[PDB]
């Protein structure tokens, strides 16, 4: 289950019981899809009518295949921003090449690979002058084919985002093509039973890029996240301004510590990015390429905030800011100066009118929290 505790001195919330799922490295698997099977093609031309019209695709992406190779690649001369943004230099190995493994990769007989060779290794998956460039249609007896409606999307995914696909599609890496490709990942059998059961939260977290087109086949690279540490004790702090002391002045304070922390090693690694941490149920998916580390003498900061022991990361002011801050379970409220704050339910809009100070309200106690005329609705959702 999930627990939360409120610290009246720091006016902050600390929510515990999240089992962290942490990304460590990346499994890179290269699918290069060839054209086929076009082998059900008639022998004869006509300017009669159906389809093809997947030509403009094999151009449109071949077009921007140079755009990245020019506007980016040549012109090259916080997670995940840099990470896959940098992990392109995995492709500078893959592309700007000859085939490398290309044909010798899959060959016969498997569509799979054991290892991709290279300056480094990789997966190789797959499916399907005087070249094509074919022009025709003829009406004889028509069936579903010449759209496997699989590649056709791959471009609109690649082109609309300019070669870098923000997440892994169903048709970019097939459900079982992604499932099996999990089975080969370098950690354990523990994270597998999860990463398979969690599969969608991989794809949201993935990156993908186009190795090549040519005419030969369309070669793209799917990078996947891999989580090394499956179940770990991680927890999240939420803060609001703790102000005090009215003789007609105000002495105020704020925690700068939030919101996330986890410790695998253990060493306690803290995740300051508003992004980089996401919740599904109990589990918390965080990006290990974020940081930093701090000591396990961080812990103290919760208990006495004024500790000479490990001076805590805070903020001072004679300036109070009346504001609201939401928790995984309840919500914190700080009403200061001349302002007016209250709560409410779905069946009554104003139930209690809150004191001026820091005050904590669980989701049994209220739903609405009215701030001076912005309503915060009390979520089940975290920071």
């Amino acid at each position: 289950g999930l627990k939360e505790s409120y610290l009246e001195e720091s006016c902050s919330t600390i929510t515990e019981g999240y089992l962290s799922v942490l990304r460590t490295g990346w499994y890179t698997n290269v699918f290069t899809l060839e054209v086929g099977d076009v082998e059900n093609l008639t022998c004869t031309d006509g300017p009669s009518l159906i389809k093809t019209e997947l030509d403009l695709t094999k151009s449109a992406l071949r077009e921007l295949k140079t755009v990245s190779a020019d506007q980016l690649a040549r012109e090259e001369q916080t997670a995940a921003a840099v990470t896959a943004g940098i992990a392109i230099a995995k492709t500078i190995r893959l592309e700007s090449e000859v085939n490398a493994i290309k044909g010798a990769l899959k060959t016969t007989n498997e569509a799979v690979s054991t290892l991709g060779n290279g300056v480094r290794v990789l997966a190789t998956a797959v499916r399907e002058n005087k070249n094509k460039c074919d022009i025709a249609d003829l009406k004889m007896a028509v069936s579903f084919s010449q759209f496997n409606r699989r590649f056709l999307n791959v471009v609109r995914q690649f082109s609309d985002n300019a070669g870098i696909t923000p997440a892994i599609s169903l048709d970019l890496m097939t459900d079982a093509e992604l499932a099996r490709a999990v089975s080969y990942m370098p950690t354990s059998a523990g994270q597998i039973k999860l990463m398979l059961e969690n599969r969608a939260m991989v794809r949201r977290k993935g990156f993908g890029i186009l190795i090549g087109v040519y005419g030969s086949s369309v070669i793209y690279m799917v990078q996947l996240p891999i989580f090394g540490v499956i179940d770990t004790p991680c927890w999240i702090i939420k803060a609001a301004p703790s102000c005090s002391e009215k003789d007609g002045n105000y002495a105020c304070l704020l925690r700068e510590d939030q919101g996330w922390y986890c410790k695998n090693a253990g060493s306690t690694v803290y995740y300051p990015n508003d992004k980089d941490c996401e919740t599904r149920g109990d589990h918390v998916f965080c990006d290990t390429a974020a940081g930093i580390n701090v000591a396990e003498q961080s812990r103290e900061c919760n208990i006495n905030i004024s500790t000479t022991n490990y001076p805590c990361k805070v903020s001072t002011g004679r300036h109070p800011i009346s504001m609201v801050a939401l928790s995984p379970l309840g919500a914190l409220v700080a009403c200061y100066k001349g302002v007016s704050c209250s709560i409410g339910s779905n069946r009554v809009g104003i139930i209690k009118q809150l004191p001026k100070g820091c005050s904590y309200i669980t989701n049994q106690d209220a739903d609405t929290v009215t701030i001076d005329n912005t309503v915060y609705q009390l979520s089940k959702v975290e920071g």
Partner: antibody
Amino acid sequence: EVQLLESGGGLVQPGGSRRLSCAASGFTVSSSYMSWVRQTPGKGLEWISVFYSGGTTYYADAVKGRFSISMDTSKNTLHLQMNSLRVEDTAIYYCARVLSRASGMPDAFDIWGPGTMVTVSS
Amino acid sequence: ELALIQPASVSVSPGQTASITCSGDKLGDKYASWYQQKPGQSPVLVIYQDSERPSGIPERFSGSNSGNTATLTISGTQAMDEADYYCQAWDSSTAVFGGGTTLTVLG
């Protein structure tokens, strides 16, 4: 093997003062969160204080400005000094360790020790 | 605020599982613990974070805590289990027990 022993109070006359001790074997003290829990014989348990190992300390309402909870951290002893002692305070006094969980927050009482009766009486 | 409250009396038929409730304020979902103390003994810790038994405690024990209320459940119910049982949790930064629950194993 990990265990605690509390150093007796005995008998203290009301308006009293006295000072207990717990010293433990098998673990440090400033290492861990620890606290004092008293029980008047036949009745139920009452937490009377806790020591957070940063030096920071909280007391149960029923004794405040009376009891002070300390550490030698040399003899590896834990002290509870009791003042202006009153009849109601008569009880066993257990010392027991408080687990650290994962973050800083306190969790459970893992091990105790037999505890040593104060009787407060004139 | 916190004060816990648990019933001072419980009975059980031998071998038939039975169990005791400790409920206060918001245990939702607050970290519990569970103590067994036979007469004249120090009390020993039967279950802590919750429904989690520490090393070398019989697994016929286990906990449940959700919402208002936490409940300690004994599957086997052998007469050696007859005792006082206490539960505790944390608040502000300070602890709380409530002292109620003896058991019985009849007849």
